[PDB]
Amino acid sequence: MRECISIHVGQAGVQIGNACWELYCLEHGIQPDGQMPSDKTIGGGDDSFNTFFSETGAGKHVPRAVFVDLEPTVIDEVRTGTYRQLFHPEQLITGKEDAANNYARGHYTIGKEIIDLVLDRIRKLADQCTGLQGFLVFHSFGGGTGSGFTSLLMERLSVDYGKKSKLEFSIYPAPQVSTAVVEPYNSILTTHTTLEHSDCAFMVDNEAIYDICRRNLDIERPTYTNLNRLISQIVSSITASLRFDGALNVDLTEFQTNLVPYPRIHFPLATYAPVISAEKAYHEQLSVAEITNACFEPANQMVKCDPRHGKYMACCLLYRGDVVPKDVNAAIATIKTKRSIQFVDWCPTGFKVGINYQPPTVVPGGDLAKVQRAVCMLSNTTAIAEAWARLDHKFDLMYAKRAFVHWYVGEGMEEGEFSEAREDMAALEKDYEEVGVDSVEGEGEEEGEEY
Amino acid sequence: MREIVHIQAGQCGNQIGAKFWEVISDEHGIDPTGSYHGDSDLQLERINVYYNEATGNKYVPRAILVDLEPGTMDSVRSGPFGQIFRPDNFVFGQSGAGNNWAKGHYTEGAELVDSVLDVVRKESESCDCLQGFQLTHSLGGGTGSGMGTLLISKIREEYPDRIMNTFSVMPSPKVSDTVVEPYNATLSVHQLVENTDETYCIDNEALYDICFRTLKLTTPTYGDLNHLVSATMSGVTTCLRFPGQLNADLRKLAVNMVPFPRLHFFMPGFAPLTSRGSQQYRALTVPELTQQMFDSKNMMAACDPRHGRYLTVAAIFRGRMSMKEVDEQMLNVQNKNSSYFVEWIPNNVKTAVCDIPPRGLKMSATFIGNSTAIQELFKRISEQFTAMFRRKAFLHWYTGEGMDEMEFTEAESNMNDLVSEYQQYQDATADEQ
Amino acid sequence: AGASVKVAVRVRPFNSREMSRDSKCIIQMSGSTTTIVNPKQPKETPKSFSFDYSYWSHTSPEDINYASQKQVYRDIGEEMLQHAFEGYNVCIFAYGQTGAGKSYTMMGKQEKDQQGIIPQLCEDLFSRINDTTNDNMSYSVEVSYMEIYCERVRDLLNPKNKGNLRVREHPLLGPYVEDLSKLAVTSYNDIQDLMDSGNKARTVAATNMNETSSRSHAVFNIIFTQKRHDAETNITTEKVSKISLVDLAGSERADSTGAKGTRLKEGANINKSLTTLGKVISALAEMDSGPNKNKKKKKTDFIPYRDSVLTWLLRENLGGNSRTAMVAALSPADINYDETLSTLRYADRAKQIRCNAVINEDPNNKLIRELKDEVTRLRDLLYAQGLG
Numbered sequence A: 001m002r003e004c005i006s007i008h009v010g011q012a013g014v015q016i017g018n019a020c021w022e023l024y025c026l027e028h029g030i031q032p033d034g035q036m037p038s039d040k041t042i043g044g045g046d047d048s049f050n051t052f053f054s055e056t057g058a059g060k061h062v063p064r065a066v067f068v069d070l071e072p073t074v075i076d077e078v079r080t081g082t083y084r085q086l087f088h089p090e091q092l093i094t095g096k097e098d099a100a101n102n103y104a105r106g107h108y109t110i111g112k113e114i115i116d117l118v119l120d121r122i123r124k125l126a127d128q129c130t131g132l133q134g135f136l137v138f139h140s141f142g143g144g145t146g147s148g149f150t151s152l153l154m155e156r157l158s159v160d161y162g163k164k165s166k167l168e169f170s171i172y173p174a175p176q177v178s179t180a181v182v183e184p185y186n187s188i189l190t191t192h193t194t195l196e197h198s199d200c201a202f203m204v205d206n207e208a209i210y211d212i213c214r215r216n217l218d219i220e221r222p223t224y225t226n227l228n229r230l231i232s233q234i235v236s237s238i239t240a241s242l243r244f245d246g247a248l249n250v251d252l253t254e255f256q257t258n259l260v261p262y263p264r265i266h267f268p269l270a271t272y273a274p275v276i277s278a279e280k281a282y283h284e285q286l287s288v289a290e291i292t293n294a295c296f297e298p299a300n301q302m303v304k305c306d307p308r309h310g311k312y313m314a315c316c317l318l319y320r321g322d323v324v325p326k327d328v329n330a331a332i333a334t335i336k337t338k339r340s341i342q343f344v345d346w347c348p349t350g351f352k353v354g355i356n357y358q359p360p361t362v363v364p365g366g367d368l369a370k371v372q373r374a375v376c377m378l379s380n381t382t383a384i385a386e387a388w389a390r391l392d393h394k395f396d397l398m399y400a401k402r403a404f405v406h407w408y409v410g411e412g413m414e415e416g417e418f419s420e421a422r423e424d425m426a427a428l429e430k431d432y433e434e435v436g437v438d439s440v441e442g443e444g445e446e447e448g449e450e451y
Numbered sequence B: 001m002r003e004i005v006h007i008q009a010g011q012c013g014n015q016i017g018a019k020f021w022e023v024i025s026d027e028h029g030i031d032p033t034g035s036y037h038g039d040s041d042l043q044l045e046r047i048n049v050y051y052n053e054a055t056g057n058k059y060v061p062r063a064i065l066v067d068l069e070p071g072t073m074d075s076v077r078s079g080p081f082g083q084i085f086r087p088d089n090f091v092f093g094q095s096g097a098g099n100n101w102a103k104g105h106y107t108e109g110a111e112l113v114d115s116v117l118d119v120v121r122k123e124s125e126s127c128d129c130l131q132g133f134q135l136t137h138s139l140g141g142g143t144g145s146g147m148g149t150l151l152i153s154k155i156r157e158e159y160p161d162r163i164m165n166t167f168s169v170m171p172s173p174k175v176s177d178t179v180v181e182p183y184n185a186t187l188s189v190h191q192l193v194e195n196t197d198e199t200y201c202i203d204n205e206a207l208y209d210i211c212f213r214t215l216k217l218t219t220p221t222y223g224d225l226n227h228l229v230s231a232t233m234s235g236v237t238t239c240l241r242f243p244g245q246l247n248a249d250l251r252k253l254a255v256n257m258v259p260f261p262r263l264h265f266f267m268p269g270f271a272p273l274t275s276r277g278s279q280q281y282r283a284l285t286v287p288e289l290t291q292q293m294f295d296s297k298n299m300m301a302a303c304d305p306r307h308g309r310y311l312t313v314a315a316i317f318r319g320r321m322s323m324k325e326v327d328e329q330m331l332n333v334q335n336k337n338s339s340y341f342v343e344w345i346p347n348n349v350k351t352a353v354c355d356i357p358p359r360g361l362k363m364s365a366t367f368i369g370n371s372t373a374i375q376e377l378f379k380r381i382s383e384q385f386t387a388m389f390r391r392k393a394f395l396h397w398y399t400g401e402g403m404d405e406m407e408f409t410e411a412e413s414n415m416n417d418l419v420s421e422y423q424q425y426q427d428a429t430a431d432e433q
Numbered sequence C: 001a002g003a004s005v006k007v008a009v010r011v012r013p014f015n016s017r018e019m020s021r022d023s024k025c026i027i028q029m030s031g032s033t034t035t036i037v038n039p040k041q042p043k044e045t046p047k048s049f050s051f052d053y054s055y056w057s058h059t060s061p062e063d064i065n066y067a068s069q070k071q072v073y074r075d076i077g078e079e080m081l082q083h084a085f086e087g088y089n090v091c092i093f094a095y096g097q098t099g100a101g102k103s104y105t106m107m108g109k110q111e112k113d114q115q116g117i118i119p120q121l122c123e124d125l126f127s128r129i130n131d132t133t134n135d136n137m138s139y140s141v142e143v144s145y146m147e148i149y150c151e152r153v154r155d156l157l158n159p160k161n162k163g164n165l166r167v168r169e170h171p172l173l174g175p176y177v178e179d180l181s182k183l184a185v186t187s188y189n190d191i192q193d194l195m196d197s198g199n200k201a202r203t204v205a206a207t208n209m210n211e212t213s214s215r216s217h218a219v220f221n222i223i224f225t226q227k228r229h230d231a232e233t234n235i236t237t238e239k240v241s242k243i244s245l246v247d248l249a250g251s252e253r254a255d256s257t258g259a260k261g262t263r264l265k266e267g268a269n270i271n272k273s274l275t276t277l278g279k280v281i282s283a284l285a286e287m288d289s290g291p292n293k294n295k296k297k298k299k300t301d302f303i304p305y306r307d308s309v310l311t312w313l314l315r316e317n318l319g320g321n322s323r324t325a326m327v328a329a330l331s332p333a334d335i336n337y338d339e340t341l342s343t344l345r346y347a348d349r350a351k352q353i354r355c356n357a358v359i360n361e362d363p364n365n366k367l368i369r370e371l372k373d374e375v376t377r378l379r380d381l382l383y384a385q386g387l388g
């Protein structure tokens, strides 16, 4: 019973959750109303996989998900939509205003009186579970709710549960495009919590996804639905290892064991290789070598950062479909001989490999082609520091003049907190610069006693 | 459920309010009688933002109408939507202010403010979660400016943690209808700058320019100006009433727009605007809306943005559109016109998207700028103010109502201070010592 | 004219409850630098700050580097009185959270062997005044005491209902408060009695931190008028000066006090006022230093006085030809760490300057390095002279 509890916070979290649960319902043969006709037609089976869905006596399947927001709008769209009968009616939406792009409003002022209900329902979901594996928290940097309330929730969860893994998928602010004037303050404030209380944070950038959609899928005018569907595919690839059989299965603990060298370096990038349109699915083989090479192309990264400017510290490749080990070994050997891809000298092995038999599914009305093979790569590297440094600069440009600060102090913060967060960020950045350095020449300086 | 109380004082406020209640009661399908005869199911989902429910499946707006002269009220009752309003909300007296700010603030309005506050308190106590207030009034008038400022002060005293918007029609250089506009405008701005979260800047010359040059109306009347105003007021609060890909409450706009407490004077704008026969010649796309929004001829405040720098801007789009186009267009506008945007804010463009457009359009957009050029407006008034205060041109009409000459000095100094911050952020560097 | 600021930070040697417990110190001071160590994270590093003055009043019977009360008074109060008697305005802010020791530094005990700032100021003022009362000279002193609560002014001495007074701007005399009682005094005893009478009227409420925490800023203003009869009829007031004694309510986090309603409103307003005061103080010091050295007149910049009543009423004292000094108290326990660091972060404002780390020698490594260097030097000397 490899069970996982999903938590969606804020507008971005709820919409990514809509995409994710559409994909999960289609993978398992579950209808929008919760019934599964496959078991009725066959007579019984394991298709009600306990990773995501809980089965009642009548044959209905209720997801193991928790949606939270301070705006009634985003979740009232779900209560009256296609999937109104799938979710439990209890959706934890405060009938009040929103955090208003304010960390303080969502952490100190209004995040209270909704936190207790959220933890009570999370407790109820965790009591139903046997062998709970971890949490998957979806939220967004730069928002009020998605930053502050996620901070509070993560703190309380780390207090209560403690040992369970807590993975985090989040939308980092982009370098150029933005949807708010006070994004840097919220991001720098919530880094201080996501550094301590999470176990592994996967960051995605909307500019990168727009570029991938433009170049690969030939979509000139994408919306958030396409980005959410791509993120859903990635999360499904991560979690497939504990839902279907495979040659090599990689659980959620092996993730953290292999990709996290030190406790403060748990910020890997994520990429998905066979992102291609139906028309271009032809004229292409889509072999293991091609997709493994495409994972390492800088253009296909989901965060606007160049891996060639840093060094790879760990890689985890999760394959789906008609894949066999020998091609994976050949592809890894080919990648190890390229000079543009540099690994830190203190990690000779480098690669973790997992294989699953279930091929990826196609969502009707989607834009990804039907393929026989796929790979999701997760790479813990040092280039991510660049993605932070830009943000730091932006923060400084506003904090020298204390712009937009009185909104934060009016909601229960003091000024010094800002400085504290900034200092923490510098320390984290410094750590990356210390771990990518090559070991000192002949690490024991030199040696050579008698004989 | 976010809910806003609407107040309208004076002739200008009442006219704009009547037109506004016709634009909002045609997007949320409401019969003039008060019944619902819409088609879409999303019209009633968030009807409680503006309307209370009455027993016969009817809907009554939260409007509160104020005036020191009864006649305007009659013009509202004998109209297309006169019967929609509750009779008890028609609070009024007699012997109007006579374009005297002192009468509106101290002598006459002080007697009627208690009744107006009683009605406001009754309306607010029934609300599930009050979001804020709106006020429509004119600075250059009598009962409008004085009573509006007095009510704003009292309400902020009673409800400090709620938003207070304000759609004010200020004086203009050439189109002036009163001889004592400078005094009223100065003493009103002295009150608005202290006790308001957001203020929107409207003046009749910009609206006339829009009517003459964009809409190509031969003989515009006040109805068209109120039409444009109502369009922007409906655009501002679209996200409280409808779903979208990226929402934007009033408080989000306040947080993102104002960098400091005293800079909350905004330049509003609306797009698209075409002149009937030209409609077939222009393709409606997001680039076209972005081009028209940032054009200096489209602003509603008669303040050229090219004479200053945008501290912040906000764009609320309505319609089914691609987020990539919105993001790329705002980034391109920032990058190309780099000289007209302040440098110590990395990105100064808020963007929001709502799914359901207006009734007869496929796409629309509302623009809220916060720029230093607004200083020019105040500076103009200040000039005229001193030109009349050095000689005490009409000062006895004000001091005869219990005022003192020092209050004028306080108001003038406060406006001059306010101009200072704008003039400051207005330059395009500071290196030399 | 110029209004250069001073920053002094004091420590308060343990109290009876903290002596009874086994609490440890965390604050150390050296030169112009203070350093604090996290009890919960002793492994990382200390945090260091630097000010104009660091006062180590931790060991009362100490003879070496003990921040005596007379030392503090000579540092700030004598200079400010001398500036006042020249015909200019001076101000003293008292900042600190509960248990810091603000009251002791501001007032002190009544044994009169270790006095605070204020009785020394008043005694020197009256002593000087009575000293220079020649045939031609005359002096008048009067006092006012008010508070600011949630951006509303109230009178502490007047026994009327605690209503909100109106703030006006006289064109020449600047901001003022209507109907604010102004009382004349003839000795420091009257000043301190009026201080007691007004302090009994402050708005004090119980939080999760202490049962009596200040919720409103307070201002005690001493107006000092000089009138000299030069030979003719010149008693016309030569100069009028202002001494401001301002008591700030400390900043707070909603975590420490999660009470809703009045407490949240008070905390938010206090934090807003403190942030605006920090901004105006920092802006005032910078241009100051600038001119004092650049003598240029970079226009008049623009100091945000109007973003709060507190800075608005103190416009004449903060700006212009004036002097300013903020004194901060930093409790000494290991339990109030979250307090103390925050106070330093507020004291870091007002001309934030480079602190530099506090690296020093490690005894074993120090001895090893010095002995190796000595061996190298002696060996080089021997080799140079052909004796090695």
Ligand SMILES: CC(=O)O[C@H]1C(=O)[C@@]2(C)[C@H]([C@H](OC(=O)c3ccccc3)[C@]3(O)C[C@H](OC(=O)[C@H](O)[C@@H](NC(=O)c4ccccc4)c4ccccc4)C(C)=C1C3(C)C)[C@]1(OC(C)=O)CO[C@@H]1C[C@@H]2O
Residues within 6 Å of the ligand: B022, B023, B026, B027, B215, B224, B225, B227, B228, B230, B231, B234, B235, B272, B273, B274, B275, B276, B279, B358, B359, B360, B361
């Ligand atoms: C055939 C056709 O396309 O009709 C359009 C039309 O021709 C145009 C010219 C309309 C028309 O607007 C005007 O001519 C006009 C004149 C004076 C002042 C303001 C507008 C229109 O009247 C405006 C009208 O707008 C609506 O129907 C919206 O619901 C609108 N509501 C009202 O105008 C309204 C007024 C009184 C009573 C009830 C509704 C609205 C706009 C913004 C926000 C909320 C509501 C529309 C689409 C049109 C006509 C009818 C010609 C335009 O106006 C607007 C605001 O959309 C002019 O610029 C647009 C471009 C449109 O193409």
Ligand SMILES: Nc1nc2c(ncn2[C@@H]2O[C@H](COP(=O)(O)OP(=O)(O)OP(=O)(O)O)[C@@H](O)[C@H]2O)c(=O)[nH]1
Residues within 6 Å of the ligand: A009, A010, A011, A012, A013, A015, A016, A070, A071, A098, A099, A100, A101, A102, A106, A140, A141, A142, A143, A144, A145, A146, A171, A178, A179, A180, A206, A224, A225, A227, A228, B245, B246
């Ligand atoms: N990829 C992706 N990003 C989104 C989506 N929705 C919002 N975002 C991002 O989220 C950021 C804003 O934060 P929000 O998620 O809207 O914060 P919130 O949930 O609305 O919380 P409040 O601000 O209090 O209302 C924007 O910069 C968007 O880029 C989405 O559906 N997909």
Ligand SMILES: Nc1ncnc2c1ncn2[C@@H]1O[C@H](COP(=O)(O)OP(=O)(O)NP(=O)(O)O)[C@@H](O)[C@H]1O
Residues within 6 Å of the ligand: C011, C012, C013, C015, C057, C060, C096, C097, C098, C099, C100, C101, C102, C103, C104, C105
């Ligand atoms: N230099 C010093 N020598 C001796 N005692 C000192 C010194 N500085 C401070 N104290 C002590 O500090 C205490 C004054 O602070 P105290 O009144 O206990 O806290 P508080 O009331 O929370 N401070 P406050 O902000 O004014 O309210 C007294 O017990 C003094 O004896």
Ligand SMILES: Nc1nc2c(ncn2[C@@H]2O[C@H](COP(=O)(O)OP(=O)(O)O)[C@@H](O)[C@H]2O)c(=O)[nH]1
Residues within 6 Å of the ligand: B009, B010, B011, B012, B013, B015, B016, B099, B138, B140, B141, B142, B143, B144, B145, B169, B176, B177, B178, B204, B222, B225, B226
């Ligand atoms: N937009 C608009 N402005 C108006 C209208 N009537 C008057 N005004 C403006 O308001 C000013 C007169 O103020 P007035 O309405 O008499 O203020 P009141 O006496 O308090 O109601 C003039 O300068 C006009 O520009 C109107 O119907 N629409």
Ligand SMILES: [Mg+2]
Residues within 6 Å of the ligand: A010, A011, A071, A098, B247
């Ligand atoms: Mg939101």
